[PDB]
Design a protein around this nucleic acid. Structure first.
Ligand SMILES: Nc1ncnc2c1ncn2[C@@H]1O[C@H](COP(=O)(O)OP(=O)(O)O)[C@@H](O)[C@H]1O
Ligand SMILES: Nc1ncnc2c1ncn2[C@@H]1O[C@H](COP(=O)(O)OP(=O)(O)O)[C@@H](O)[C@H]1O
Ligand code: SF4
Ligand code: SF4
Ligand code: BEF
Ligand code: BEF
Ligand SMILES: [Mg+2]
Ligand SMILES: [Mg+2]
Lengths: 686, 683
DNA sequence: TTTTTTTTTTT
DNA sequence: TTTTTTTTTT
C-alpha cells in the first residue's frame, strides 16, 4: 500500500536528474502533482484506477513514465504505455523514452504494433524480382505477387535491401520509402513481426496503441499477464470509441458458403476421431448427433438469409439497419438458437484442437491442427456475433444490428453485424477489473467541467475506488500566444467546401509570404479537404511535409531538421498531427486549423445511438457531436504552447466560432488567448 | 510531529505514574524507550522501531504512555498486540487499569479470535435440553444435546453467569472447566460486543495471530492507516506470520468432482433465475463445463502422482525436499492456479451480482455462492504458492497429507513459505504508518541481523534498531542454581530426570524460604509427568490446564499477598511476559533448555535449505530460539530493584555441552551455585 | 429549444 | 558444531 522509501527516493532522484537533462528545465507544479498521484495509484496506495486530466503541454509523458518505470522495476512488472495512434507511439519511443534513457541508461523499452503493419518477407521477395512477369493464363492462376511496374519493383528492392541493411524494422511507418495502400496490402499477408513481438517479454516499457491493447486483452496472447501489468492509457479519452470499434462483430452468413463450412467441419471432426481418437468421445462428435446439429444450424441460417434478403434489393450491394437495435421477433428467435448452436460447435472445435495439440504422426497432425484452428476461429466469430445479436441491451444501451450484401470476386456475400453502443461493462471485464491499477490520462477528459461523460462512457466509477483529478495549466497562454480568427466570408458548410478552402488557402499563402514563422502546422478534419487544399499551394510543395507522402513521424523528424536549419517547413496532416504531437518553440509557431471537426454521423452505430439518445429525450448533437468537436479543438489549439518559451498563434478558419450558438462554448473550453480577427484576401476557387 | 503539547502530556502522565507506583525507582532505559516510541509513532524518526529492552525494565508503560497520548491527540486506535491470551489478560487487568486512574476517561478493550467466544445459541441448547436417550430420530437430527446431565448443569451455570454479566463469554475468562470437545460445541452475542468495543476503543489489546488475520481478512481492525501498532514480545512475529501464511486445500478427487458439479449447477441456476445483465464468458455452460473438466482431470492426475509417494491406502504424508516439486507436478500446479483463480473470480462476480440484487430463494443461492467463493479462494491461494520456486528469498515448503475423518480418506495439499519477510512487508510494514516491535530478545549474536532477515524490517526502509540496557543489579540480586543432576535431559532419560527434578524441587519447597515459585516446562508431557511426583503438594500448586492461565496468576497473587506459599506451574504462556515483583516470585524452576522441535515439514525443509547454503541448522533454527527462551524464562525472576531469589535450571547441559557457555553468556551475569540432588525415585 | 458529416487501429 | 513439540488464528 504505502509507497516505499526506496521508491519515493528513486522517483525524486530521476525527476531531479531531469533538471540537468532538459537544460531549459522549468519547474511545473502540475507535473509534480501528476507524478505523485500516478505513483499512488500504480503502487496500490489509494484506490483502483486514476483518471487524471492535465492540460496540453503540462508534460504528462514524463509525469507517468518516471513513476511507472520506478514501480515497474521495483515490482518486476511491465509498464504498458498506450496512446491513440502510431505517430504518438513513435514520438514516445523516439523522443521521450530516449531522453529518459539518458537518465536510466539500462532502461529496456520496446514498441508493439499489430501484425498488419509488418511487411511479410515472402511477399517482399516476390514483389522485388528483377524478371517479374508474363501475362500467362498460368500466371493468372498462379497469381503470386508481381511488381506492377518497374519503379514499384525498385521500391521493393530498396525496402528489401534496407531490411537486410537493417535500416528498416518491418513496420509500414518506420521507413522513408513511401508505400501504397494497395502495395502495403500485398506486402503484408523469424519474420519481423515475431522479432518485434519477442522484445515485449524482456522490455520494462512497452509502447502500444489502444486498438492493440483491446485486442491484447481479448486475445490474451500479445502482452504479459494482466496481473503483471502496469498500464497507462495516454490520450485516454479515445478508449470508449476504440473499445466500441474493437468489440464490433461481423460474420458472413451466406447460406451455401455456410453449408460448405458445416460439411467440412463434420468431415474434419470425423477424421480427427478416426486418426487421433480421444479417450472420451464428445457426444456432439457422434456423426448422427453432429449432423443433426449442423442441419438445424444450417436451416436457421437459410431462413435468416431469406428474411434478410427480403430487406435488400435482389442482386445488388445493399444494407439494412434495424432501428433502435430491435429485431423482429422471428429474427431474434433465430439469433438466440444460432448463439446456442454455434457456441456448441465452437466448444467442440476447441476441444479437438486442445486434444490434437497436446498430442505433439507429426506432419499429418500439424495439418489437422491448422484446419481445426481455422474452424475454431470461424465458430468463435459466429458465437460472439449471435450472442451479441440476441442481447436487447448491453451496458444500458441497445446493440446496433445490421446486415450487408457486399461483393467479392463477382459474388455477393451476406454479412451480419453487431455493435454494442455502450461498452462500459466490457471495459470492466477486459481492463478495469483485470489490471490492478491503470492510469487514464489526457488533456481533454472532462466534458462541461465534469467527469460525468467519461464515467458514463468508460464505466470508471468512484464506488469501485477510481479517482478523478483535474490539474491546472502552468503556462500563461495570453503572455505567449494569440488565437486569430480571420473574417472569412463563408462558414465551412457542405455547400461551401470549395469556396472556404480557397479563402483558407489565400490567407495561408500570405502567412507564408509574411516570413514570420519558420515552423507551422496545417490541420484538416478530412483527407479530402486536405488533398483539396494542396491543389492551391502546389507552387509551395517543396516546403510542405504532407501526411501520406512519408510515414507520419518521419515527416515530423524532417520538419524538426529543417526548422533547425532556419528553413521554412510546414507540416500538413490530420488527426495524427492534431493531438499529442510535441514541437517546442520555433519548431511550431503557427498552427492553422481548417475547421471545427464535427464527427461524421452516417454510421449505423452512430445513428442507432442517435435514435436511442432521442428515445431517452437527450439531444444527439449535445451528446455525441459537440463534445467531440470541443475535445478536438482543445487538442489542436494545444499544439502551440509546449513550454514557457513557446510562442506564436493559432489560426482557426471556422467563422462559426463567432457565428453559431456553440462557438462561445467552444472558445470557453480553450485556454485563455487574446483573439484577433484580420481580414482575408479574395479566394479564387479553381 | 512531537509537538510541545504532546511532549508535555506524555511527560505529565509519566509524572503522575510516579505517585501511582510508590515503589518507583528511576529507570533510565524506560525513559529512553518512551522518547523513542513517541518519536517513531509520531512519524518524527523513520518508519518503524525495533527496540530491545531487557526483562523487567518496564516496557508495557514505556510504549503504553506515548501510544495513548499520540492516539488520543490524533484520532487513531492504539493496537497493542502480544504473544498470547495470558499476556493479553495481563495488560488488560493490570497495566491498563493502572494508568486508567491517571486517565479516568481512557477506553480500552481486548480483541480475540472468534473461536474463543461462546455461541449463545449453542449454550442455550446445551443447558436447556436433556441428554437424549439413544434414539435414531435424535441421532438423525444431531441437535446439540449434552452427553450427560452433569454437562447440562454446567452449561446452565455458564449461561447463568453469562446472562448475569458475570462471564464475558470468552473461554479464558470463566473458572468453570471446559474440555476441548465441549468448547468445540459451545462455540460457532459476546463476540460482536467485543468487536463493537474495538470500534471506539483508544487501546485494543490483541495477539499476533489476530493481527495477522486482521491484515489478510480486513475486518477485525480499523483502517490500517488510522492505527498505532505495538508488537510486544515481537520476536514471535515471523513464526506467527509463517504459521498464518500456510495455505492448505483439499484435493480429494471424488470430493473435487462433487464440488465442481455443484458449482456448475449453481452457476446455471443463477443464470436461469437471476440472470446478471452482463454474462461473463466463463459462465457460458459449454465453457464452464470445459473449464471444470480440465480442472478435474488435473486434480485426478495430481491425486495419482501424490498417491505414488504415500503409504498405500492409509493416513500418510509426503514432503518434497527443498520445496522443489517434480516438473510434472509443477506444471499441474501452475495450471491449477490459473483454473482455480478464474473460478474464484467467477464466484466472486456472481456473489456481487446476486448480492446487489425474491428473498428466500435468492438468499439461499447467495449463501451457496459465498461458500463456493470460499472454496475457490482457498484453492487459488494454495496453487499460487505451489507454483512459486521461491518466496522472500527462500524455498516454499510443499507437502501432501492423507487424513481420515468419518471412515474416508481426504487428500490435502499444503504450502508455506519458509521466509515471509516480503509478505510481512506487504501486509504489515507497508500497511501501518508506524509500528513498534519490542521485546527483551530481539538480537541474537549481539546483532539485529537475525531479526532483520526474519522480519523484513530494514534500515533502507527507514526502520530504526535500538538496544537498551538493564538497570537492575542481577549479580547483587539473584543466583543461578544449577543442581548437579545425575542424568542429562535427553530422551531415553526423561523419566529419570523428571524424578530427580521433583526430588530437588520438593526439598526447595520444604525449606520454606520462598513464598512465590514458578515452575516452567518445555512440554505438557514433561509437566504432567512431573506432577505425578508432587501430588501431595497439590493444594499449593496452581497448574496450567486446571483454570484459565491468568486466573491462575490472580489466585497466585492473592495467596502470596496473604502470606500463603504458592507455586505456579505452566508452560510457554508463563515463561515470557508474566510479571510477579518481589514476594510474588522469588524462585523460578526451569525444567530444560527449550530447544524447538525439529519435526515440521517446514522446519526440515528449512534445515536442508540452510544446509545447501552451507549453514549449520543448529546454529540458525535451534540454538537462537533456545537462547531467547532461556533469557525470557530467567527474566521472570528480577522485575525490580529489591527483587531477589534464584532461578534453578535443571538442565546440566549448560555445563556439560559446548553450547552451554553461549547460553550462559547470553544471560545477565549471575553467580552460579551447583548444589547436590537427592536420589531420584522413579514412580 | 438547440444541431452535425468521414480519423485511426486491430482482429 | 547438535536439537525434539507452545500458541493462535482464517
Ligand atoms: N519541467 C519541464 N521543463 C521543461 N520542459 C519539459 C518539462 N517537462 C516536460 N517538458 C517537455 O515539454 C514538453 C511537454 O510536452 P508533453 O509531455 O508532450 O505534454 P503533454 O502533457 O501534452 O503530453 C515536451 O517536449 C517535454 O519533453
Ligand atoms: N519505574 C519503575 N519502577 C519500578 N517498577 C516499575 C517501573 N515501571 C514499571 N514498573 C513495574 O515493573 C513491572 C515490570 O514491567 P513490565 O512492563 O512487566 O516489564 P517488561 O519490560 O519485561 O514488559 C511492572 O509491574 C511495572 O508496572
Ligand atoms: S510468417 Fe507472416 S511474415 Fe513471415 S513469411 Fe509467413 S507470412 Fe510473411
Ligand atoms: S454468535 Fe453469531 S451465531 Fe452464535 S448466536 Fe450470537 S449471533 Fe447467532
Ligand atoms: F496533452 Be499533450 F498536448 F499531449
Ligand atoms: F521483557 Be519483560 F519480561 F516483558
Ligand atoms: Mg501527450
Ligand atoms: Mg513485557
Amino acid at each position: 500500500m504505502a509507497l516505499t522509501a526506496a521508491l519515493k527516493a528513486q522517483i525524486a532522484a530521476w525527476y531531479k536528474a531531469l533538471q540537468e537533462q532538459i537544460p531549459d528545465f522549468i519547474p511545473r507544479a502540475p507535473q509534480r502533482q501528476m507524478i505523485a498521484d500516478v505513483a499512488k495509484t500504480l503502487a496500490g496506495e489509494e484506490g483502483r484506477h486514476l483518471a487524471i486530466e492535465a492540460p496540453t503541454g503540462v508534460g504528462k509523458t514524463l509525469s507517468y513514465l518516471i513513476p511507472g518505470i520506478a514501480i515497474a522495476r521495483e515490482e518486476q512488472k511491465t509498464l504498458v504505455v498506450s496512446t491513440a495512434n502510431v505517430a504518438l507511439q513513435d514520438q514516445i519511443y523516439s523522443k521521450d523514452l530516449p531522453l529518459l534513457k539518458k537518465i536510466i541508461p539500462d532502461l529496456k523499452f520496446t514498441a508493439a504494433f499489430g501484425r498488419g503493419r509488418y511487411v511479410c518477407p515472402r511477399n517482399l521477395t516476390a514483389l522485388a524480382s528483377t524478371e517479374p512477369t508474363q501475362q500467362d493464363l498460368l500466371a493468372f492462376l498462379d497469381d503470386e505477387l508481381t511488381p506492377n511496374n518497374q519503379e514499384e519493383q525498385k521500391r521493393c528492392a530498396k525496402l528489401k535491401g534496407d531490411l537486410d541493411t537493417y535500416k528498416w524494422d518491418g513496420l509500414r511507418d518506420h521507413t522513408d520509402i513511401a508505400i501504397d495502400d494497395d502495395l502495403w496490402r500485398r506486402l503484408s499477408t523469424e519474420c519481423p513481426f515475431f522479432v518485434a513481438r519477442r522484445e515485449i517479454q524482456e522490455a520494462e516499457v512497452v509502447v502500444a496503441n489502444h486498438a492493440l491493447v483491446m485486442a491484447a486483452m481479448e486475445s490474451e496472447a500479445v502482452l504479459p499477464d494482466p496481473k503483471n501489468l502496469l498500464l497507462v492509457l495516454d490520450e485516454g479519452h479515445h478508449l470508449p470509441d476504440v473499445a466500441r470499434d474493437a468489440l464490433e462483430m461481423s460474420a458472413e452468413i451466406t447460406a451455401p458458403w455456410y453449408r460448405l463450412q458445416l460439411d467440412l467441419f463434420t468431415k474434419l471432426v470425423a477424421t480427427c476421431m478416426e486418426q487421433f481418437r480421444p479417450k472420451t468421445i464428445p457426444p456432439l462428435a457422434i456423426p448422427e448427433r453432429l449432423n443433426a446439429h449442423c442441419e438445424e444450424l444450417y436451416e436457421l441460417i437459410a431462413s435468416l438469409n431469406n428474411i434478410l434478403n427480403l430487406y435488400m434489393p435482389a442482386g445488388q450491394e445493399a444494407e439494412h439497419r434495424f432501428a433502435m437495435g430491435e429485431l423482429p421477433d422471428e429474427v431474434l428467435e433465430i439469433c438466440q438458437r444460432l448463439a446456442k448452436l454455434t457456441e456448441m460447435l465452437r466448444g467442440l472445435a476447441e476441444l479437438f484442437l486442445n486434444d490434437l495439440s497436446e498430442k505433439t504422426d507429426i506432419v499429418r497432425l500439424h495439418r489437422l491442427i491448422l484446419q481445426m484452428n481455422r474452424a475454431l476461429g470461424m465458430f468463435e466469430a459466429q458465437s460472439k456475433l449471435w450472442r451479441l445479436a440476441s442481447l436487447a441491451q448491453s451496458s444500458g444501451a441497445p446493440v446496433t444490428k445490421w446486415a450487408t450484401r457486399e461483393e467479392r470476386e463477382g459474388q455477393l456475400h451476406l454479412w451480419f453485424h453487431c455493435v454494442g453502443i455502450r461498452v462500459s461493462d466490457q471495459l470492466e471485464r477486459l481492463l478495469w477489473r483485470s489490471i490492478p491499477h491503470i492510469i487514464v490520462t489526457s488533456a481533454t477528459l472532462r466534458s462541461l467541467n465534469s467527469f460525468s461523460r467519461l464515467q458514463e462512457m468508460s464505466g470508471l466509477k468512484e464506488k469501485a475506488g477510481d479517482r478523478f483529478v483535474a490539474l491546472d495549466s502552468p503556462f500563461n497562454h495570453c503572455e505567449q500566444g494569440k488565437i486569430v480568427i480571420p473574417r472569412m466570408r463563408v462558414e465551412p458548410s457542405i455547400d461551401n467546401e470549395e469556396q472556404h478552402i480557397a479563402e483558407m488557402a489565400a490567407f495561408f499563402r500570405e502567412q507564408v509570404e509574411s516570413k514570420k514563422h519558420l515552423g507551422m502546422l496545417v490541420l484538416f478534419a478530412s483527407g479530402r479537404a486536405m488533398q483539396r487544399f494542396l491543389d492551391y499551394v502546389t507552387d509551395l510543395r517543396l516546403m510542405l511535409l504532407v501526411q501520406g507522402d512519408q510515414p507520419r513521424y518521419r515527416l515530423v523528424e524532417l520538419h524538426r531538421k529543417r526548422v533547425a536549419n532556419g528553413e521554412r517547413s510546414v507540416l500538413v496532416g490530420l488527426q495524427s498531427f492534431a493531438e499529442g504531437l510535441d514541437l517546442k518553440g520555433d519548431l511550431l509557431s503557427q498552427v492553422h486549423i481548417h475547421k471545427i471537426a464535427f464527427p461524421p454521423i452516417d454510421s449505423p452505430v452512430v445513428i442507432t445511438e442517435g435514435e436511442w439518445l432521442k428515445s431517452l429525450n437527450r439531444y444527439p448533437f449535445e451528446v455525441q457531436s459537440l463534445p467531440s468537436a470541443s475535445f478536438n479543438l482543445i487538442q489542436q489549439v494545444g499544439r502551440l504552447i509546449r513550454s514557457h518559451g513557446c510562442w506564436g498563434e493559432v489560426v482557426i478558419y471556422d467563422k462559426r466560432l463567432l457565428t453559431k450558438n456553440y462557438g462561445k462554448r467552444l472558445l470557453d473550453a480553450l485556454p485563455v488567448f487574446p483573439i484577433e480577427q484580420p481580414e482575408v484576401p479574395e479566394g479564387i476557387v479553381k
